Amino acid sequence: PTSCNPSDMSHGYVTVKPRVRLHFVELGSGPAVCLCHGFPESWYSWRYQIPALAQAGYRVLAMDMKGYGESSAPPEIEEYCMEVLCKEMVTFLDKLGLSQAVFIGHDWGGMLVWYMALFYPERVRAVASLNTPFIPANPNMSPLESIKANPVFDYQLYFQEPGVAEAELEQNLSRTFKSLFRASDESVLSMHKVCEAGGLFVNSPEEPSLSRMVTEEEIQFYVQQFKKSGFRGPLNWYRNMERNWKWACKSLGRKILIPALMVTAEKDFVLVPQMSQHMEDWIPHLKRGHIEDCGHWTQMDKPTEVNQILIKWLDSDAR
Amino acid sequence: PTSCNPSDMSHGYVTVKPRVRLHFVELGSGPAVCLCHGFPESWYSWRYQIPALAQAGYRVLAMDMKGYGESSAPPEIEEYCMEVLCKEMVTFLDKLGLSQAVFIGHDWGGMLVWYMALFYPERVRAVASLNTPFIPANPNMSPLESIKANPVFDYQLYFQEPGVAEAELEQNLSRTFKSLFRASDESVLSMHKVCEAGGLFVNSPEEPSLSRMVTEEEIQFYVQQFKKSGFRGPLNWYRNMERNWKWACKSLGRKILIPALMVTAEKDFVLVPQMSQHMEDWIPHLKRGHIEDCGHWTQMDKPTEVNQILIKWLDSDAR
Ligand SMILES: CC(C)(C)N1CCO[C@H](COc2ccc(NC(=O)NC3CCCCC3)cc2)C1
Ligand SMILES: CC(C)(C)N1CCO[C@H](COc2ccc(NC(=O)NC3CCCCC3)cc2)C1
Ligand SMILES: [Mg+2]
Ligand SMILES: [Mg+2]
């Protein structure tokens, strides 16, 4: 599938708060489709989708989320709570003069677009998430224990204390992204042993091989992007669990009434498909997609399957 | 009519040549409408149109033309010939992934969009010009004498030699724009006596009053923009008459077959309406608008009339 060369895109910049501007890349004409990447990624994680969606008749806006790339990265941890991130994305639409947009997200971006669907349905034409389920907030369970209930989320505790994960992730950025951006059968890390081993990579190769999913050039683009602001901003998306919990609780009782799509990846061992199994009860018009042989990095593991799923859904439920 | 605050726009940047990027502001959703300002102006000359068109259902892209504002201003005079300017605007569309756009232009921007219609009709959904007629190139008359045939174009000779006009226009930028941006009944200069008086302003007030059309704040925005790159780039649009002549001649014999709109201003004493009187013969589907009591600065003299004319035409002949 056709990918993207970064210097041949149109780059757009929108100021949403005094010291916060969002960067995005824009390709195509038609209904506005806003792509929202996950951790720790980039607008460029959508490189295989951007030209495909544009060619299918859509105006694509691929975000550098707050903390990433060319977008502003405010220093405060609480600027990356889900509530401020959504309200900024509404201002984004406001300043662009868009009444609504289709929202498609992956990982933390997928969490974001569900909350945009839940609290700002008037502004979301339709919503799709890759891997990330929508699970109503449990007003009786704190976020801390719901992590301790599943050892797979052990790495999110390691991510909590500022500066600890930043040092590991920034010590060798090429090692970082070659160790992360891998297919499930190629993985070189266990999210289980992280807080017991003292880090994500301490048992991983120092000179990791290059995944079949990516080139050295594509790795070096991510590396370039993260020299700009580092990992604090991105990691901060994990450091608002209790804030995000309380805000999510303020919604309870309402369904998402807009067209929706949940895409599951069969070998995402963290965002496993079954975590999504009763979303229909909260999202009446939910349609599904599922990708076999697909790990966590959905857009680059299986670009063609993603493109097909998205375009079929956009043409039937977004126009 | 609703105007624009510059810090609350979405700003877009597209690289079209190695050292040339075009800046534009983008508001709204719908068919792409590209606004192209004249001399010596800015995307901000369209401030009264941008929100009105967006509200009517159009995606507005208001350009900072090459040499202006936040767009690149290459040093070479021949980079501002009409041929390079159009081909760059095609690349603009290419890099944005737009198959076509409606093009609307004023003064030199209006000249540009006619040539985009003439040589790139496949890329122009529809075309409109304010004040600037389309007059087929006369392959038997050089541009120099066709100026000497009408003393009104005397100032274009004064504009020819690099550095001469730049010094006058840059010596007091507030004086420059308050002396230029005026209604016809308020004008303080004669384009007739310029090469005989030795300049545009030498007989004009040193502290000119402020036109009823503009505020001090709006003057200061233009002033800010022109501190960036000065007047050489903009003036260079006038310094390619023979190049533009030869290229225009290479078209002769073809009509503009796409939907078109010519808007005349009754008190534009340079781009007078009669200069447009036989465009129908070269442009079969041409529709007209005409604004009484309107000087050269069409968008800010008579914003409401402009908006009405444009939106009615866009809705009937552009969709
Ligand atoms: C119960 C649930 C689901 C709500 N939990 C527990 C409590 O809080 C978190 C908050 O929600 C999210 C949402 C997305 C992610 N994505 C992620 O971690 N991607 C990793 C990138 C690096 C390699 C491994 C994968 C993480 C957390 C989730
Ligand atoms: C015959 C014709 C029409 C082709 N001529 C003669 C030969 O070449 C020029 C080239 O075409 C253009 C096109 C637009 C402009 N606009 C302009 O001058 N605006 C001024 C701003 C400052 C105050 C006064 C008005 C000028 C020249 C025109
Ligand atoms: Mg159920
Ligand atoms: Mg005739």
XYZ file of C-alpha atoms and ligand atoms in Angstrom:
696
model
C 0.000 0.000 0.000
C 1.050 3.568 -0.789
C 2.892 5.139 2.133
C 3.879 8.768 2.827
C 6.990 10.878 2.424
C 6.857 13.487 5.232
C 8.298 16.426 3.240
C 5.587 16.073 0.532
C 2.609 16.520 2.852
C 0.587 19.601 3.632
C 1.168 20.496 7.281
C -1.514 22.244 9.319
C -1.178 24.015 12.650
C -4.021 24.973 14.999
C -3.642 26.803 18.336
C -6.204 25.488 20.816
C -4.864 26.983 24.096
C -2.390 29.841 24.733
C 0.710 27.642 24.618
C -0.724 24.570 22.853
C -0.854 24.156 19.094
C -1.790 20.915 17.369
C 0.017 19.814 14.204
C -1.623 17.592 11.622
C -1.126 16.467 8.035
C -4.021 16.909 5.561
C -4.655 14.913 2.370
C -7.717 14.565 0.157
C -11.154 16.100 -0.258
C -14.514 14.987 1.123
C -15.863 14.235 4.612
C -13.351 15.125 7.309
C -11.656 12.071 8.863
C -9.453 12.683 11.905
C -6.837 9.985 12.697
C -5.505 9.814 16.254
C -2.421 7.696 16.954
C -1.430 5.833 20.119
C 1.655 5.383 22.322
C 4.356 6.044 21.483
C 3.646 7.038 17.878
C 3.002 9.802 15.351
C 0.750 11.012 12.536
C 3.184 8.895 10.496
C 1.773 5.748 12.088
C -1.104 6.321 9.650
C 1.180 6.540 6.576
C -0.499 3.554 4.858
C -4.044 4.852 5.573
C -3.659 8.536 4.657
C -3.322 8.130 0.844
C -5.792 5.188 0.767
C -8.563 7.122 2.546
C -7.937 10.252 0.472
C -8.169 8.170 -2.711
C -11.492 6.749 -1.456
C -12.986 10.248 -1.284
C -12.151 11.534 2.212
C -10.352 14.576 3.599
C -7.796 13.085 6.008
C -6.384 14.995 8.996
C -3.678 12.892 10.649
C -2.847 14.341 14.063
C 0.362 14.686 15.976
C -1.373 14.259 19.329
C -0.507 16.568 22.202
C 2.994 15.799 23.470
C 4.144 14.354 20.137
C 6.150 15.408 17.133
C 5.365 18.947 16.002
C 2.462 19.437 18.423
C 2.952 21.330 21.564
C 3.995 19.351 24.655
C 3.021 21.356 27.740
C 4.969 20.365 30.839
C 2.054 19.688 33.224
C 0.934 16.090 33.775
C -2.739 17.069 34.087
C -2.756 18.632 30.605
C -2.872 15.059 29.287
C -6.013 13.962 31.107
C -8.644 12.660 28.719
C -10.974 15.591 29.503
C -8.548 18.338 28.465
C -7.448 16.310 25.433
C -11.004 16.001 24.123
C -11.967 19.603 24.776
C -8.837 20.603 22.860
C -9.934 18.380 19.981
C -13.324 20.128 19.962
C -11.548 23.495 19.770
C -9.496 21.931 16.935
C -12.719 21.350 14.998
C -13.990 24.785 16.006
C -10.934 26.610 14.703
C -10.990 24.604 11.469
C -14.690 25.391 10.993
C -15.767 21.723 10.954
C -19.198 20.953 12.412
C -18.278 17.295 12.776
C -15.593 14.825 11.795
C -15.258 11.080 11.622
C -12.802 10.064 14.346
C -10.538 7.016 14.046
C -8.058 6.139 16.774
C -5.588 3.509 17.885
C -4.355 2.615 21.349
C -4.584 5.837 23.427
C -5.957 7.605 20.344
C -8.696 5.016 20.242
C -9.495 5.673 23.875
C -9.613 9.370 23.026
C -12.052 8.975 20.141
C -14.416 6.855 22.247
C -14.565 9.639 24.793
C -15.113 12.157 21.980
C -17.996 9.964 20.857
C -19.316 9.600 24.407
C -19.183 13.258 25.523
C -19.184 15.154 22.181
C -21.424 13.071 19.910
C -22.715 16.221 18.191
C -19.167 16.796 16.895
C -18.395 13.197 15.866
C -19.906 12.135 12.554
C -18.776 8.541 13.237
C -16.127 6.827 15.338
C -13.774 3.865 14.879
C -11.132 2.434 17.213
C -8.250 0.046 16.494
C -7.629 -2.465 19.342
C -8.830 -0.193 22.158
C -12.251 -1.283 23.459
C -14.776 1.006 25.075
C -15.499 -0.154 28.622
C -17.827 1.982 30.779
C -16.168 3.364 33.903
C -16.745 1.256 37.024
C -17.628 3.796 39.750
C -16.832 1.214 42.443
C -13.322 0.147 41.347
C -10.349 2.513 41.507
C -8.008 2.394 38.495
C -5.006 1.237 40.587
C -6.483 -2.146 41.538
C -8.090 -2.732 38.146
C -4.466 -2.710 36.994
C -3.359 -4.981 39.842
C -6.260 -7.250 38.826
C -4.590 -7.904 35.445
C -0.790 -8.382 35.512
C -0.638 -7.523 31.794
C -1.075 -3.803 32.627
C 1.970 -3.974 34.954
C 3.918 -1.599 32.680
C 1.444 1.207 33.365
C 2.639 1.282 36.979
C 6.229 1.505 35.782
C 5.011 4.447 33.641
C 3.550 6.307 36.635
C 6.466 8.090 38.346
C 7.775 11.007 36.218
C 11.256 10.612 34.789
C 11.643 6.873 35.422
C 10.282 5.539 32.143
C 11.538 8.644 30.273
C 15.171 7.762 30.971
C 14.827 4.204 29.689
C 12.832 5.163 26.595
C 15.155 8.060 25.707
C 18.502 6.370 26.395
C 18.689 4.878 22.882
C 15.773 5.967 20.727
C 16.631 3.637 17.855
C 16.757 0.713 20.264
C 13.459 1.908 21.758
C 11.445 1.916 18.541
C 13.001 -1.203 17.024
C 12.192 -3.014 20.288
C 8.597 -1.743 20.290
C 7.518 -1.690 16.621
C 7.483 -5.460 16.046
C 5.067 -8.168 15.015
C 3.703 -10.394 17.755
C 5.776 -13.391 16.635
C 8.884 -11.118 16.787
C 8.296 -9.518 20.219
C 11.326 -9.199 22.505
C 9.711 -8.039 25.756
C 7.239 -9.102 28.441
C 4.962 -6.447 29.904
C 4.578 -8.822 32.889
C 8.075 -8.651 34.364
C 8.655 -4.906 33.905
C 8.246 -3.642 37.478
C 9.980 -6.833 38.665
C 12.853 -6.484 36.166
C 13.172 -2.723 36.652
C 12.332 -1.651 33.112
C 10.921 -2.541 29.720
C 14.139 -3.369 27.869
C 16.527 -4.677 30.505
C 16.071 -8.242 29.200
C 15.824 -7.199 25.540
C 18.664 -7.173 22.982
C 20.895 -4.104 23.021
C 21.126 -4.160 19.211
C 17.652 -5.465 18.266
C 16.961 -6.757 14.793
C 14.663 -4.803 12.495
C 11.047 -5.983 12.356
C 9.660 -7.157 9.034
C 7.010 -4.419 9.484
C 9.356 -1.411 9.206
C 12.467 -0.071 7.521
C 15.478 1.564 9.098
C 14.362 4.808 7.434
C 10.916 4.633 9.063
C 12.480 3.918 12.471
C 14.715 6.961 12.008
C 11.678 9.142 11.339
C 10.138 8.263 14.702
C 13.573 8.743 16.266
C 13.765 12.222 14.737
C 10.273 13.120 15.989
C 11.019 12.100 19.580
C 14.223 14.107 19.807
C 11.903 17.144 19.687
C 10.064 16.731 22.998
C 10.974 13.320 24.375
C 8.754 10.885 26.194
C 7.329 12.864 29.139
C 4.374 14.224 27.186
C 3.416 10.871 25.678
C 3.950 9.047 28.989
C 1.697 11.637 30.634
C -1.275 10.089 28.823
C -0.886 7.233 31.363
C -0.586 9.502 34.413
C -4.221 10.642 34.677
C -5.994 7.373 35.470
C -7.895 8.664 38.467
C -8.733 11.973 36.777
C -9.906 10.078 33.663
C -11.816 7.687 35.918
C -13.814 10.451 37.644
C -14.621 12.168 34.345
C -15.670 8.900 32.688
C -17.914 8.221 35.680
C -19.703 11.532 35.090
C -21.171 10.006 31.903
C -22.500 6.721 33.209
C -25.861 5.773 31.972
C -25.571 7.018 28.403
C -25.006 4.977 25.289
C -23.021 6.041 22.245
C -25.765 6.610 19.663
C -23.601 7.449 16.600
C -22.220 5.036 13.949
C -19.284 3.136 15.370
C -16.676 0.539 14.453
C -14.534 -1.622 16.716
C -11.548 -3.326 15.079
C -9.881 -6.137 16.994
C -6.368 -7.556 16.476
C -5.979 -11.275 17.120
C -2.409 -11.124 18.481
C -2.598 -7.927 20.476
C -1.701 -9.540 23.787
C -2.476 -6.385 25.772
C -5.568 -4.968 24.035
C -6.945 -8.471 23.520
C -10.183 -8.819 21.482
C -12.325 -10.248 24.308
C -11.925 -6.984 26.227
C -14.469 -5.664 23.692
C -17.013 -8.446 23.941
C -19.997 -6.535 25.317
C -19.562 -3.131 23.685
C -22.792 -3.717 21.725
C -24.766 -3.228 24.939
C -23.436 0.328 25.299
C -23.107 1.157 21.553
C -26.265 0.083 19.678
C -25.084 0.743 16.093
C -21.638 -0.823 16.580
C -20.129 -2.662 13.631
C -17.082 -4.859 13.923
C -13.892 -5.705 12.156
C -11.302 -8.286 13.127
C -7.786 -8.854 11.812
C -6.126 -12.252 12.134
C -2.323 -12.482 12.533
C -2.259 -8.842 13.703
C -0.288 -7.588 16.693
C -0.539 -4.305 18.570
C 0.822 -2.087 15.763
C -2.255 -2.470 13.631
C -1.708 0.132 10.938
C 1.738 -1.105 9.903
C 1.337 -4.817 10.664
C -1.698 -5.205 8.369
C -2.151 -1.948 6.402
C -4.198 -3.466 3.563
C -6.695 -5.183 5.865
C -7.020 -1.969 7.889
C -7.611 0.146 4.767
C -10.254 -2.274 3.477
C -12.083 -2.432 6.801
C -12.018 1.364 7.197
C -13.077 2.279 3.661
C -15.987 -0.195 3.597
C -17.215 1.155 6.933
C -16.718 4.814 5.981
C -18.646 4.390 2.724
C -21.594 2.633 4.365
C -21.927 4.312 7.775
C -20.114 7.676 7.539
C -21.555 9.264 4.389
C -19.852 40.879 8.017
C -17.829 38.526 10.215
C -14.106 39.158 9.847
C -11.082 37.115 10.992
C -8.691 37.182 13.920
C -5.357 35.840 12.579
C -4.326 33.879 15.706
C -7.603 31.863 15.667
C -7.166 30.411 12.181
C -5.796 27.071 11.102
C -2.559 27.687 9.204
C -1.422 25.328 6.458
C 1.995 25.041 4.848
C 2.809 23.281 1.569
C 6.284 22.976 0.000
C 6.000 23.165 -3.785
C 9.688 23.659 -4.759
C 12.915 23.057 -2.781
C 13.002 26.516 -1.204
C 9.374 27.586 -1.761
C 6.552 26.831 0.644
C 3.084 28.331 0.349
C 1.160 29.385 3.459
C -2.619 29.463 3.555
C -5.448 29.665 6.073
C -8.193 26.992 5.960
C -11.784 27.316 7.213
C -14.889 25.224 6.597
C -15.870 21.941 4.985
C -17.144 21.221 1.478
C -15.862 21.946 -2.042
C -12.373 23.430 -1.986
C -12.313 27.178 -2.735
C -8.897 28.790 -3.199
C -8.716 32.595 -2.708
C -5.811 34.442 -4.321
C -5.139 38.047 -3.298
C -3.635 40.897 -5.319
C -0.988 43.614 -4.892
C 0.083 44.445 -2.323
C -2.090 42.311 -0.041
C -2.484 39.137 2.010
C -4.716 36.152 2.768
C -6.183 38.651 5.252
C -7.590 40.684 2.367
C -10.227 37.929 2.276
C -11.105 38.266 5.994
C -14.765 39.140 5.263
C -15.175 36.277 2.734
C -13.479 33.416 4.604
C -16.117 32.912 7.362
C -19.015 33.730 4.976
C -17.986 31.107 2.399
C -17.276 28.506 5.085
C -20.725 29.131 6.580
C -22.243 28.636 3.104
C -20.795 25.119 2.911
C -17.318 25.540 1.393
C -13.792 24.604 2.449
C -11.855 27.873 2.101
C -8.090 28.011 1.488
C -6.945 31.639 1.602
C -3.430 31.909 0.181
C -0.460 34.008 1.103
C 0.740 34.224 -2.496
C 4.406 33.707 -3.290
C 6.433 36.664 -2.022
C 3.892 37.559 0.673
C 3.414 37.109 4.378
C 4.341 33.626 5.574
C 4.905 32.211 2.080
C 8.336 31.869 0.737
C 9.748 34.820 -1.227
C 12.528 33.529 -3.484
C 14.936 36.244 -4.584
C 14.795 35.712 -8.371
C 12.564 37.984 -10.460
C 11.639 35.186 -12.881
C 10.199 33.046 -10.068
C 7.192 35.384 -10.181
C 6.324 34.895 -13.840
C 2.749 33.741 -14.300
C 3.894 30.340 -15.628
C 5.910 29.351 -12.552
C 3.211 30.746 -10.253
C 0.506 28.578 -11.815
C 2.583 25.417 -11.957
C 3.326 25.949 -8.265
C -0.402 26.264 -7.599
C -0.972 22.949 -9.397
C 1.671 21.330 -7.177
C -0.188 22.971 -4.253
C -3.316 21.038 -5.230
C -1.240 17.923 -5.869
C 0.357 17.939 -2.431
C -3.001 18.594 -0.764
C -4.578 15.719 -2.709
C -7.227 17.913 -4.378
C -8.282 16.908 -7.894
C -9.730 20.357 -8.500
C -10.574 23.555 -6.676
C -12.703 26.590 -7.325
C -10.326 29.519 -7.832
C -11.243 33.099 -6.914
C -8.771 35.936 -7.370
C -8.404 39.688 -7.180
C -6.026 42.011 -8.988
C -2.872 39.946 -9.724
C -4.553 36.970 -8.042
C -7.389 37.353 -10.497
C -4.941 37.348 -13.373
C -3.425 34.205 -11.884
C -6.720 32.331 -11.629
C -7.627 33.157 -15.235
C -4.376 31.600 -16.359
C -5.060 28.595 -14.111
C -8.419 28.318 -15.851
C -6.858 28.777 -19.290
C -3.931 26.331 -19.002
C -5.076 23.981 -16.187
C -8.843 23.687 -16.671
C -8.771 20.054 -15.511
C -7.665 21.320 -12.081
C -10.082 24.269 -11.806
C -13.619 23.334 -10.809
C -14.718 26.940 -11.478
C -13.074 30.353 -11.609
C -14.006 33.877 -10.499
C -12.045 37.129 -10.721
C -12.575 40.447 -8.923
C -11.830 43.499 -11.144
C -9.181 41.800 -13.297
C -10.522 41.006 -16.783
C -9.282 38.208 -18.987
C -7.908 39.626 -22.236
C -6.302 37.205 -24.724
C -2.637 37.929 -25.406
C -2.029 40.049 -28.513
C 0.862 38.303 -30.318
C 1.543 41.470 -32.334
C 1.815 44.033 -29.503
C 4.668 43.972 -26.990
C 3.663 44.620 -23.365
C 5.786 47.805 -23.105
C 3.783 49.811 -25.653
C 0.423 48.432 -24.540
C 1.340 50.207 -21.304
C 2.450 53.355 -23.135
C -0.889 53.155 -24.982
C -2.763 53.728 -21.694
C -1.235 56.314 -19.318
C -3.163 54.752 -16.414
C -0.653 51.852 -16.296
C 2.220 54.365 -15.908
C 2.971 53.058 -12.397
C 3.908 49.644 -13.786
C 6.931 51.238 -15.465
C 7.920 52.826 -12.169
C 7.622 49.284 -10.723
C 10.032 47.800 -13.281
C 13.562 48.568 -12.035
C 14.429 46.512 -8.909
C 14.853 48.452 -5.689
C 13.292 51.726 -6.860
C 9.689 51.096 -5.859
C 10.813 48.933 -2.896
C 12.453 51.901 -1.175
C 9.374 54.105 -1.464
C 6.929 51.389 -0.407
C 9.086 50.264 2.537
C 10.119 53.688 3.858
C 6.984 54.013 6.019
C 4.818 50.913 5.842
C 1.939 52.444 7.787
C 1.921 55.410 5.428
C 2.088 52.977 2.498
C -0.998 50.950 3.374
C -3.102 53.853 4.640
C -2.334 55.648 1.358
C -3.262 52.587 -0.719
C -6.193 50.948 1.110
C -8.778 53.681 0.483
C -12.156 54.097 -1.143
C -12.237 55.750 -4.546
C -13.764 58.963 -3.176
C -10.907 59.051 -0.591
C -7.949 58.389 -2.936
C -4.828 60.504 -2.400
C -2.722 59.538 -5.426
C -2.680 59.639 -9.226
C -1.216 56.663 -11.062
C -0.765 59.064 -14.016
C 1.944 61.349 -12.644
C 4.072 58.675 -10.944
C 7.013 58.412 -13.355
C 6.765 62.192 -13.860
C 6.620 62.922 -10.109
C 9.271 60.336 -9.233
C 7.127 58.083 -7.062
C 3.682 57.052 -5.898
C 3.451 59.062 -2.677
C 5.569 62.152 -3.246
C 2.417 64.290 -3.595
C 0.450 62.371 -0.950
C 0.064 63.316 2.733
C 2.899 62.252 5.018
C 0.417 61.417 7.795
C -2.582 60.160 5.771
C -5.981 59.834 7.368
C -7.456 56.388 7.935
C -9.907 55.168 5.291
C -13.458 54.388 6.347
C -12.799 50.862 4.984
C -10.157 49.827 7.551
C -9.072 50.148 11.160
C -5.673 51.049 12.524
C -5.428 47.460 13.788
C -6.032 46.032 10.301
C -3.434 48.394 8.802
C -0.949 47.219 11.431
C -1.541 43.602 10.435
C -0.507 44.281 6.840
C 2.412 46.315 8.190
C 3.488 43.338 10.301
C 3.232 40.956 7.330
C 5.396 43.128 5.074
C 8.195 43.496 7.600
C 8.798 39.780 6.933
C 9.929 39.913 3.298
C 9.300 43.435 2.049
C 8.083 44.510 -1.347
C 10.546 42.942 -3.816
C 8.654 39.663 -4.086
C 5.257 41.294 -4.576
C 6.671 43.889 -6.993
C 8.231 41.024 -8.956
C 4.744 40.016 -10.109
C 4.975 43.118 -12.364
C 8.475 42.352 -13.671
C 7.628 39.439 -15.991
C 5.447 41.144 -18.598
C 7.325 39.844 -21.605
C 7.719 36.359 -20.119
C 3.989 36.314 -19.254
C 3.234 37.651 -22.732
C 5.066 34.821 -24.533
C 3.473 32.154 -22.335
C -0.018 33.627 -22.761
C 0.559 33.646 -26.518
C 1.251 29.901 -26.432
C -2.451 29.381 -25.615
C -4.091 31.491 -28.284
C -7.027 29.948 -29.935
C -8.567 28.208 -26.940
C -11.577 29.282 -24.948
C -12.085 28.802 -21.226
C -14.759 26.089 -21.130
C -15.327 25.882 -17.335
C -17.864 27.837 -15.213
C -16.651 31.379 -14.730
C -17.562 34.648 -13.036
C -16.302 38.155 -13.738
C -17.004 40.763 -11.053
C -16.574 44.403 -12.006
C -16.116 47.393 -9.667
C -17.656 50.656 -10.839
C -15.003 52.968 -9.345
C -11.901 50.924 -10.004
C -10.197 53.566 -12.121
C -7.397 51.212 -13.178
C -9.175 47.869 -13.674
C -12.186 49.635 -15.173
C -15.254 47.488 -16.028
C -15.177 48.100 -19.800
C -11.815 46.325 -19.993
C -13.929 43.161 -19.596
C -16.551 43.899 -22.215
C -15.903 41.064 -24.662
C -14.826 38.259 -22.337
C -17.977 36.320 -23.303
C -16.451 35.653 -26.723
C -13.535 33.778 -25.135
C -15.416 32.334 -22.102
C -18.760 30.836 -23.209
C -20.236 30.058 -19.760
C -19.220 33.391 -18.199
C -21.565 34.899 -15.634
C -21.230 38.434 -14.375
C -21.428 40.463 -11.236
C -21.072 44.211 -10.854
C -20.655 46.335 -7.735
C -21.637 50.001 -7.747
C -19.742 52.485 -5.531
C -16.820 50.027 -5.331
C -13.174 50.995 -5.745
C -10.130 48.817 -6.341
C -10.100 47.149 -2.896
C -13.177 45.098 -3.587
C -13.225 42.692 -0.665
C -13.040 45.367 2.036
C -14.864 48.198 0.254
C -18.034 46.131 -0.298
C -17.679 42.836 1.626
C -21.411 42.067 1.813
C -22.016 42.557 -1.912
C -18.947 40.428 -2.677
C -20.092 37.626 -0.352
C -23.582 37.620 -1.875
C -22.290 37.565 -5.445
C -19.798 34.782 -4.668
C -22.131 32.524 -2.689
C -24.953 32.730 -5.254
C -22.501 31.864 -8.029
C -20.792 29.078 -6.065
C -24.117 27.424 -5.217
C -25.398 27.508 -8.798
C -22.291 26.926 -10.936
C -19.662 25.319 -8.663
C -21.525 22.424 -7.028
C -8.956 -1.481 32.000
C -8.275 -0.487 31.050
C -8.325 -1.075 29.630
C -9.106 0.808 31.030
N -7.039 -0.313 31.372
C -6.668 -0.360 32.708
C -6.665 1.007 33.392
O -6.180 2.072 32.639
C -5.799 1.851 31.312
C -6.043 3.130 30.468
O -6.437 2.923 29.125
C -5.469 2.554 28.157
C -5.768 2.627 26.803
C -4.815 2.249 25.862
C -3.567 1.788 26.263
N -2.574 1.389 25.277
C -1.266 0.790 25.556
O -0.874 0.576 26.653
N -0.406 0.444 24.437
C 0.900 -0.141 24.707
C 1.985 0.615 23.938
C 3.354 0.048 24.312
C 3.443 -1.476 24.123
C 2.272 -2.244 24.750
C 0.919 -1.639 24.385
C -3.272 1.715 27.606
C -4.214 2.094 28.538
C -6.355 0.602 30.599
C -3.379 45.334 -20.535
C -3.126 44.709 -19.157
C -4.443 44.757 -18.363
C -2.774 43.224 -19.356
N -2.237 45.376 -18.504
C -1.196 45.982 -19.191
C 0.056 45.112 -19.300
O 0.392 44.372 -18.170
C -0.450 44.409 -17.055
C -0.389 43.058 -16.295
O -1.593 42.633 -15.684
C -2.008 43.221 -14.464
C -3.013 42.632 -13.707
C -3.422 43.225 -12.517
C -2.841 44.410 -12.079
N -3.274 45.030 -10.837
C -2.829 46.323 -10.311
O -2.034 47.006 -10.863
N -3.381 46.791 -9.051
C -2.934 48.069 -8.516
C -2.510 47.911 -7.056
C -1.953 49.240 -6.546
C -2.921 50.416 -6.761
C -3.487 50.496 -8.183
C -4.009 49.150 -8.679
C -1.846 44.993 -12.830
C -1.438 44.403 -14.007
C -1.909 44.861 -17.266
Mg -24.520 -7.957 25.841
Mg -18.469 39.681 -28.438
